[PDB]
Amino acid sequence: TWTAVDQYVSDVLIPKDSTLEEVLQVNAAANLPAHDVSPTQGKFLQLLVQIQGARNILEIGTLGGYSTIWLARGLSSGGRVVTLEASEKHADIARSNIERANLNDRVEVRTGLALDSLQQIENEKYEPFDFIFIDADKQNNPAYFEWALKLSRPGTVIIGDNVVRIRRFYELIAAEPRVSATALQTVGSKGYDGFIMAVVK
Amino acid sequence: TWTAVDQYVSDVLIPKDSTLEEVLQVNAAANLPAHDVSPTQGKFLQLLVQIQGARNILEIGTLGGYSTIWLARGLSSGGRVVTLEASEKHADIARSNIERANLNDRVEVRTGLALDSLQQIENEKYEPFDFIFIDADKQNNPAYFEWALKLSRPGTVIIGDNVVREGEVIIRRFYELIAAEPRVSATALQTVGSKGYDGFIMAVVK
């Protein structure tokens, strides 16, 4: 009944969003992998971006663009979100959802193998990112975290999704002196979303 | 066995700290009101203070000073933490714990009924606080939240603990209160603790 309770809290704290309502209706037909939907996590992402005052955001794992919207919603002056997704189809649906929320002018959806794109970004003039969101596979978490670090600077915030309800991924982080982190979770449609919150030293 | 898994995670991610170690040993004899201990939440507080770059912090519900330590550790320059605790005894033990963490030069523990102190702070020059942590009793949350807002400014971060979830199975009006408060935007999160999960709200003043 706690899930039920936090589910209700999410509903009252986070006001109905017609835009996000349809984005989810679209994803319902986009055949996305298999993930959880969490308004409270999205909200967390937007507020955190605002607290930090992030201007250059990197997201690994665009999916349907749901989290992309929440992140872009937090952007400051003339900020930007660069989001990566391998699937040509899913990225296309994501671009449409992002346009629907009228944020396509501050979001760049890069299609292709994440690792290739990460290398291309490192080979380009992209300044280090101030905020990075990782919502990927799992066999990929270790790699994406190391790459997030690679494209960061002191003070960069890294949020990484883990599992919807492992030890080695945290041991990895715990074994990474360049970062200081903690772990928490928030409720979602299909259970709680666990994630790490880290700051680069 | 998710609680077990998350407590293990808390153990690897957060480095054992001898200072906080003894602070807890001291509190073990302080006869403090029933509460949970969460290194992951403490870390969250320190990191968030650092991300925001908070310099003027207010804490409501000092207890033994455990959370006060994590917050003060997040300050940088000549920042300050003003923390309130009603119990003279518990506040004395808290200032001692803060002292052994060598953060007494950055923390002010105000003893007395929280409501009186909140009014005193308003009638004084502390002006607006950049970050506020509420860790108090029930029936008091609604009041402390409104007072937190009262002593805030646009951009102020407010973290408020609600309930400990030491079980799957087994509040509503409080979050409704927040939802009914246009001056803030908020979300709800949880982190594992010694005796269950700590539920809390994270809000930013508009």
From TrEMBL, chain B:
Alphabetized UniProt keyword annotations: Methyltransferase, S-adenosyl-L-methionine, Transferase
GO biological process, any: methylation
Organism domain of life: Bacteria
Single GO molecular function: S-adenosylmethionine-dependent methyltransferase activity
Sequence positions that bind S-adenosyl-L-homocysteine: V37, L63, S67, E85, H90, A114, D137, Y144
Keyword Translocase included in the entry's annotation: no
InterPro entries the record matches: Cation-dep_OMT, SAM-dependent_MTases_sf, SAM_O-MeTrfase
CDD domains recorded: AdoMet_MTases
Record protein name field: O-methyltransferase, putative
Organism field: Bacillus cereus (strain ATCC 10987 / NRS 248)
